[PDB]
């Protein structure tokens, strides 16, 4: 699930979690949104909602990185931001 968010003066307008020691979900060290601010990029978009995981962002994978990388990649937005979200399914 990809979403083409346009970088605005305000910013992202939400929060995230990610990585060992700072994981958002047990068993998954991916980057998940923990709190979306009103009138924010995600909030306004509607596609991104609490519980989603960040597969990749700007060509980089956000599923095997620490929290620093989760924030560094979310903050690494120039004109546009290509967010890649993975669909949670699992086998077990």
């Amino acid at each position: 699930m990809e979403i083409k968010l346009i970088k605005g003066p305000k910013g992202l307008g939400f929060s995230i979690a990610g990585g060992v020691g700072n994981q958002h979900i047990p068993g998954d060290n991916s980057i998940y949104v923990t709190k979306i601010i009103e009138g924010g990029a995600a909030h306004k978009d509607g596609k991104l909602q609490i519980g989603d995981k960040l597969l990749a962002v700007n060509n980089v994978c956000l599923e095997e990185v620490t929290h620093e990388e989760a924030v560094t990649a979310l903050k690494n937005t120039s004109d546009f931001v290509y967010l890649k979200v993975a669909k949670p399914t699992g086998s077990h």
Binding site: G11, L12, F14, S15, I16, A17, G19, G21, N22, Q23, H24, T34, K35, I37, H67, V71, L74, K75
Partner: peptide
């Protein structure tokens, strides 16, 4: 666990 805003 750590949750930071961005």
């Amino acid at each position: 666990r750590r949750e930071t805003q961005v």
